[PDB]
Every structure is written in C-alpha cells, then in structure tokens.
C-alpha cells in the first residue's frame, strides 16, 4: 500500500481577520499529524498516535526549529515582495515530502509557491532548482551555489523522510493500515423523458483510494462517465460515485477486492 509523509509551510504578509502570519502542518497520507502556528508558537500533535508515541522532548525540539523557520519565512517573503515590487498581502508556501510506493520504490519532492503558484521546484536527481520566472531564477542561482545544502536536501528526501514515514506508519498502524470495505449501491432513474441515469454509489470506505467504472457488455464505456469526488464522510471514511446515461454493470476496486454490480 502507498504511503506518504509531507510537511507544509504557509507565510502571509500583512494578515487580516485573525489569520496567522505563519502555519506549518504535517501529514501522513490524508491525515494531519503535527501543527505549528505563529499564534500558539508551539509544535503540537494532530493525531492521538503521534501524541502517544513521541515524548515531550520531540515537541520541545521541533517547537524551537519551527520558531526559527517562522522567522526565515517572514524574511524570505519580504525579499520576494521586494524582487516583485509587490505591496500589501502576499503568500509564500513550501511543501516537503516523500512517498513509499507499492513496489518499494520511493519518491521525494521539495517545492515553493508564491501567491499559490509554482515558484521553485527541486530536482534531487540533477541537484537543481527549476525556476518559473526571473525572480525565481535569482533564488535558484543563490541556492545552487550552496552544493552541500543540495546534497543535504537529497539525503533528507531519499533517506530521512522515508525513515520518518515508516516510523509514523508503525505508530499509526491501526488507523493507516486498516481496510474498511465500501458499501456499494446502483441507482436507476428516468430523468428528462427518455433519458435514464445510472449512479453507482460507494460509501464507508477506507483508504480513500477507490476505482469505480461502468461497463457495457463487459467492455469499457465509450460514452461519457460523470465522476463524483472522493469525499470525507466525517467519521474517517469516504464516499464517491460514478454515473452514466443508458447490459450495464458497475465495477468497483478497493484494497485488492474487485466488486461487480450488474443492472
């Protein structure tokens, strides 16, 4: 099963309406694990299995680092705004992480965004930063001059991040490695006169990864399939649907179990 660990940072210059200047949140798959902001000034667990498995010394150490990274984020955003000749409120974001895939092969990523748009994308294979414009190119030039830091980032992505992910996965096993099979139903209704719609609806499933498709005589529909988003139900489980307008059967694949609902 595919798993991921990611840490995000959000910086807001001149924030209004009680919005913090800085937020940092961690995730294991779709699950929040850690939280830090410029209001609390404390790094806290966001999952009970994180709280129960990491001693106060972990939270104390990371609170110090996050306060440091909060300061650096404020300065970086000010330098970006100066480069752009931008006034008022602007955002700066960072996402760092890794994935451990089904075959044991791994992925790693480190990205930045300015105003919610890609700014700098790290390439750990060439040890280089991809820059979207001339302002990002100036930062790319500066970061690339520090070869040791690029190597440190490649090691963190490929080795450290994967070790943290595996550690957090063991802590959260009962949540992260569980399987809650879907409850699937097929609904049939004449909508506009002469147009019948078939909805294949699934709910109560975990993990959120589900494949839902419509088949005509055991072959892939050439017609348009309308897809429902995989949505959280609010109880740790998910729901989704797929519809067609009409021999038809709905196919559902979830956690190594295939299901067919013939109409």
């Amino acid at each position, epitope marked *: 099963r595919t798993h991921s660990l990611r840490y995000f940072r959000l910086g807001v210059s001149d924030p209004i309406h009680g919005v913090p200047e800085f937020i940092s949140v961690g995730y294991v798959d779709s699950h929040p694990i850690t939280t830090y902001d410029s209001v609390t000034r404390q790094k806290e667990p966001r999952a009970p299995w994180m709280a129960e498995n990491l001693a106060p010394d972990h939270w104390e150490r990371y609170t*110090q680092l996050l306060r440091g990274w909060q*300061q650096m984020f404020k300065v970086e955003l000010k330098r970006l705004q100066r480069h752009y000749n931008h006034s008022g409120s602007h955002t700066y974001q960072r996402m760092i992480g890794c994935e451990l895939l089904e075959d044991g092969s791994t992925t790693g990523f480190l990205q930045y965004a300015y105003d919610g748009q890609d700014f700098l994308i790290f390439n750990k294979d060439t040890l280089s930063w991809l820059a979207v414009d001339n302002v990002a190119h100036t930062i790319k030039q500066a970061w690339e001059a520090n070869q040791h830091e690029l190597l440190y980032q490649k090691n963190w992505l490929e080795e450290e991040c994967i070790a943290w992910l595996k550690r957090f996965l063991e802590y959260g096993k009962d949540t992260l490695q569980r399987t809650e099979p879907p409850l699937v139903r097929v609904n049939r209704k004449e909508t506009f006169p002469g147009v019948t719609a078939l909805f294949c609806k699934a709910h109560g499933f975990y993990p959120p990864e589900i494949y839902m498709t419509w088949m005509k005589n055991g072959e892939e529909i050439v017609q348009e399939i309308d897809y429902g988003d995989i949505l959280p139900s609010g109880d740790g489980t998910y729901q989704a649907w797929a519809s067609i307008e009409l021999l038809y059967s709905c196919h559902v694949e979830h956690s190594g179990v295939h299901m067919v609902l013939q109409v």
Partner: antibody, heavy 109, light 113 residues
Framework: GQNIDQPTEMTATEGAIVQINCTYQ??????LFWYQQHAGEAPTFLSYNVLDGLEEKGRFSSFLSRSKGYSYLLLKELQMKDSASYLC??????????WGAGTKLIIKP | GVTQTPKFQVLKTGQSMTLQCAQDMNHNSMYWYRQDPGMGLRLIYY???????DKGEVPNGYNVSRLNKREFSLRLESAAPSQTSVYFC?????????????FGEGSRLTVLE
C-alpha cells in the same frame, strides 16, 4: 543518536600521510562535519559529507561511508602546522550535533 | 564573525558572571558550548533564531538571553568550581542542514573557593 568515536591521539611524521577515523552510531543522519582546533584556539570548519564519497580540499580529504557509519579525514604532505585536535561531529535525525572527544594529532619533525 | 568576551576570568564560588557574544554574520542560530578534557563539546543553551532559546545537554547552573539577532549572553548566577571550563560561543545561519559553525575565541573560566 547515541555515540561518536575517534582515536584519542595520533602521531605521524612530517611529509607523510595520516587518516583520522570517526565512527558514528545515530538514529538518523543529516551530515558529518570535521573541525580543526589548534591548542588554545577556536575550532574552525574543515569539511562536510552527507552522501557516500571523498571530498578533496587541498592536502585534506574527507570520506564518508553511510552503510559502514564511518568517516575519515585524510591529511597528505604533513606539515608541523597540521599539529592540532581534529573534531568529528555528526548531525542526527533532529538536526542535533553529537561531537567526538577529538583526536590530538602530533607531527614528528 | 563571532566576538566573545572575556577571554579569561577568575571567580570566587558564589559570584555572578555574564559572558558576552556578538555575531555580525546575519546568522539566526547561536550556541553556548563548554569544552572539557577527554570529552566532546557539550551544548549548554542554544537560540534557533531571535526571540527564542532552549536548554542544551548541560543547562544547570546557567541561563541565557538572546538580546537581539546579534547577541546571545550566558549567565553564571552562582559560580561553582564544576563551572571551571573553556566556554565557546558559536553561530550558524540556521540550526538544521549543512550550515557551518563559526566559533568565538573562547572564554577560560576558573572558579575557586
């Protein structure tokens, strides 16, 4: 991580070569640093390794083996000025530095 | 880049003492270490950036103040003979990464009865 080891003292001859070994045992790894500290002076940065390989800087070279959890600082064409303590430091999973007790290098003229 | 005072100091047991440190390298991270024979550098206190400080490995008998981005002072409130050591102030751009430390010249402290 738990511990870092390097020899207490090393003696070599002027003009020759010396290898200062450093083994570390940490939970997580974010780099290994070498510092030089002359008697009665402050430590100064020499090198940094995070991935496998040898990094050369003049007469000095720094090696790292991740699988072996081992590093060495190699000093070629030894000079009297090379007499100092060599400090080995490893950065753990929480970015904390674990320092070795140092290796005093004595050069025989 | 790192200025540390005083280079030498003799104190009586129970005396108060402040060690100064200033860095002009525009670094965020500052550290106070003690160096003793037969052992590796031991961190007393550190400051990851302006506005924050935390205990190191050996904080007992010490206190710190990160006064501003440049200054990080170490206080010995009641000098004890076990505090006889060589104290080093250091700084790095930030705590994590391949960031090189720059050390101050050292402060040789002797605490006597």
């Amino acid at each position: 991580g738990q511990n870092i080891d390097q020899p207490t003292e090393m003696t070599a001859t002027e003009g020759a070569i010396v290898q200062i070994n450093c083994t570390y045992q940490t939970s997580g790894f974010n780099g290994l640093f070498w510092y030089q500290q002359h008697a009665g002076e402050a430590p100064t940065f020499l090198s940094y390794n995070v991935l496998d390989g040898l990094e050369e800087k003049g007469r000095f070279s720094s090696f790292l083996s991740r699988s072996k959890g081992y590093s060495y600082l190699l000093l070629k064409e030894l000079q009297m000025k090379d007499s100092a303590s060599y400090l080995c430091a490893a950065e753990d999973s929480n970015y904390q530095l674990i320092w070795g007790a140092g290796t005093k290098l004595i050069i025989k003229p | 880049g790192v200025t540390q005072t005083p280079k030498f100091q003799v104190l009586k047991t129970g005396q108060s003492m402040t060690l100064q440190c200033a860095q002009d390298m525009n670094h965020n991270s500052m550290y106070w270490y003690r160096q003793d024979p037969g052992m590796g550098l031991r961190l007393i206190y550190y400051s990851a950036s302006e506005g924050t400080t935390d205990k190191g490995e050996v904080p007992n008998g010490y206190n710190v103040s990160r006064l501003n981005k440049r200054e990080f002072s170490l206080r010995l409130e009641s000098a004890a003979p076990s505090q006889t050591s060589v104290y080093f102030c250091a700084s790095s751009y930030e705590v994590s990464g391949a960031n090189v430390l720059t050390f101050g010249e050292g402060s040789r402290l002797t605490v006597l009865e």
